[PDB]
Amino acid sequence: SSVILTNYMDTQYYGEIGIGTPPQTFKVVFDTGSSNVWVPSSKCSRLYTACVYHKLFDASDSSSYKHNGTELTLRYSTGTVSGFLSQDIITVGGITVTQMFGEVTEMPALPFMLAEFDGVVGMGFIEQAIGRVTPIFDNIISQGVLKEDVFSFYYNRDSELGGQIVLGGSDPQHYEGNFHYINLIKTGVWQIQMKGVSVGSSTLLCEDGCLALVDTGASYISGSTSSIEKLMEALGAKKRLFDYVVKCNEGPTLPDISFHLGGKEYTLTSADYVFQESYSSKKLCTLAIHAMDIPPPTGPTWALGATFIRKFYTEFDRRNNRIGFALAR
Numbered sequence: 001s002s003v004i005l006t007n008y009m010d011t012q013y014y015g016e017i018g019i020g021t022p023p024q025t026f027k028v029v030f031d032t033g034s035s036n037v038w039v040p041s042s043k044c045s046r047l048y049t050a051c052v053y054h055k056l057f058d059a060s061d062s063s064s065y066k067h068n069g070t071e072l073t074l075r076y077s078t079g080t081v082s083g084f085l086s087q088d089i090i091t092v093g094g095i096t097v098t099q100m101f102g103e104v105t106e107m108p109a110l111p112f113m114l115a116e117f118d119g120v121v122g123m124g125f126i127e128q129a130i131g132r133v134t135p136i137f138d139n140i141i142s143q144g145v146l147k148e149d150v151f152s153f154y155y156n157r158d159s160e161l162g163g164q165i166v167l168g169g170s171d172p173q174h175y176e177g178n179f180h181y182i183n184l185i186k187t188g189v190w191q192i193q194m195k196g197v198s199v200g201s202s203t204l205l206c207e208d209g210c211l212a213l214v215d216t217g218a219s220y221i222s223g224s225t226s227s228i229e230k231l232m233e234a235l236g237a238k239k240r241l242f243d244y245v246v247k248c249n250e251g252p253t254l255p256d257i258s259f260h261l262g263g264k265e266y267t268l269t270s271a272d273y274v275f276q277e278s279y280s281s282k283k284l285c286t287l288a289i290h291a292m293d294i295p296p297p298t299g300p301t302w303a304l305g306a307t308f309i310r311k312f313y314t315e316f317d318r319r320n321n322r323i324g325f326a327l328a329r
Contacts, residue, residue, distance in 0.1 A: 001093035001146075002171065003030070005155070006116075007162030010275070010288070011219040013155050013306060014117040015165060018091035019101070020062030026055050026118045030153075030165055031217025032190045032316060033303070035129035036074055037090070037136055038102030039119035041083055045105065050112035057086075057103055064089045072102050072131045074120075077218075077292055082106040085131060092121070093167055097139045123151065123216065123316070127188030128298075140167065141318070149319035153216050154328060155309045175313035179324035182262035187321050189298060190214050192261060197227075197302070199234045200255030211301035212261065213294065214314060214323050218305030221273070222292035227302070231257070231289065243290055246274065249281035257289070259304070266312060266325065273307055 003015040006027070014027045019039065026039045042058035044051035059065045066087035073082040083104040090099045104119070126135050141149055146168030154174040155163040164171060170179075182192040194212040197205035205227055223231065228244075235254055237244040246254065254270035275286045288307040293299065315324040 001095050001167045003093040003165040003167070004161055005030075005163035005165060007156055007158060008116040010158045010306065010310075012116050013163045013216075015093075017121065019057055020059075020088045021064040022061075023091060024055070024057055024061065026057070027116065028119045028121045029117050029217055030121050030123050031215070032123045032153075033213060033215040033217045034074070034076070034120065035122035035124035035126060035135045036072075036102055036131070036133060037099060037119070037121050038074060038081060038083065038104050040107055041103035041105050043103060043105045044083075044107060048105075048107050049109045050107040050115070053113060054107075054115075055118045059086060059088075059103070062088055068100065070131060074102065074130055077294065079108055079111045081108075081112075085133065090136065092136070092140070093165070095140055095143075095145070095167065097136065097143065099136050099139055100133045120217065124190060125188040137167075137318070150315055150317045152313065152315045153309055154313050155216075155306050157310060170313070170315050174329050175326035176329045177327050179315060179326045180262060180264050181317070181320075181322045181324045183320070183322040185211070190316060190323065191298065191301060192323055194259060194261055194302060195263075196260040197223075197231070198258045198260070199231055202234075203260075204234070205231060206260075206302070211299075212259070213298065213301050213303045214308075214316070215303045215305050216309065216314070218292075218303045219307075220288045220290045220303075220305050221268075221307040222290050222294075222303040222305065224300050224302075225291045225293055228289070228291035232287075235287070237287060244287050245284035246287060247281050248276065248278050248283045248285040251276050251279075251285045259308070261325070264325070266308070268307070268311060272311055
């Protein structure tokens with residue numbers, strides 16, 4: 001089964017899922033960095049403008065709904081949501097599964113007023129599921145329909161499909177060459193060992209080794225504040241409140257950035273990490289690489305998001321606990 005994704009500004013990739021009977025439609029980001037499912041709730045006070053601007057799940061309109069009500073809070077790197085647990089049928093790419101999810105009643109305007117999507121579908125492991133709720137992919141596997149215990153991600157460029165998720169396999173139509181796998185450092189987290197990060201002609205980063213969270217929910221490639229300081233200083237980039245910019249005219253002159261994973265060099269060109277909105281030296285162009293300190297036990301860690309995925313088709317193998325990369329097509 002495949003899920004078609006919409007690409008919004010190269011920063012938000014989302015697909016649609018159906019919840020309840022009759023189905024209530026929601027736009028959601030599929031995030032390998034988290035393990036819970038949540039959508040805005042009809043029970044969210046309208047004083048939360050984000051809720052006024054998003055699809056709200058209404059339990060009183062679903063004959064398949066099953067009450068639970070256990071309170072829960074989901075804390076992401078850029079924001080927090082809170083609400084309670086509910087159970088209902090969810091349709092994903094044609095597949096129907098009974099799932100426990102969060103009905104969010106507290107959704108901060110910043111950052112949610114800026115979210116094109118309504119909610120999130122955690123594709124992570126149960127180990128990191130808040131409230132220990134069984135993850136949707138685990139619930140799908142338990143059905144015994146998928147030919148393989150794996151899911152794949154394809155994120156296209158902004159274009160004028162925005163992307164695609166394949167449940168139970170991969171789509172040869174979106175990658176070339178063959179996959180190269182890196183075993184997970186530990187089950188329960190889609191994090192792999194990274195052997196080094198080179199900027200141009202000087203592998204001055206992640207010397208001695210470091211961690212890499214393969215995060216489909218992260219818009220950018222991220223690293224600790226220290227690491228990014230060195231990387232950016234090397235690029236001649238100036239820091240701002242929530243990102244780094246470079247004068248547009250020099251964007252194309254920026255050096256390649258390579259990530260050493262599993263004995264393979266995954267290389268990105270400046271065209272791959274710079275939002276080349278123009279070539280004026282009188283304008284600032286943002287870079288799709290940010291500083292992000294991810295707390296323990298997962299972090300400190302680098303995070304490989306959309307910026308990386310766009311270039312490399314990614315397969316998440318639950319059966320062999322590893323991740324495979326291939327040149328996106």
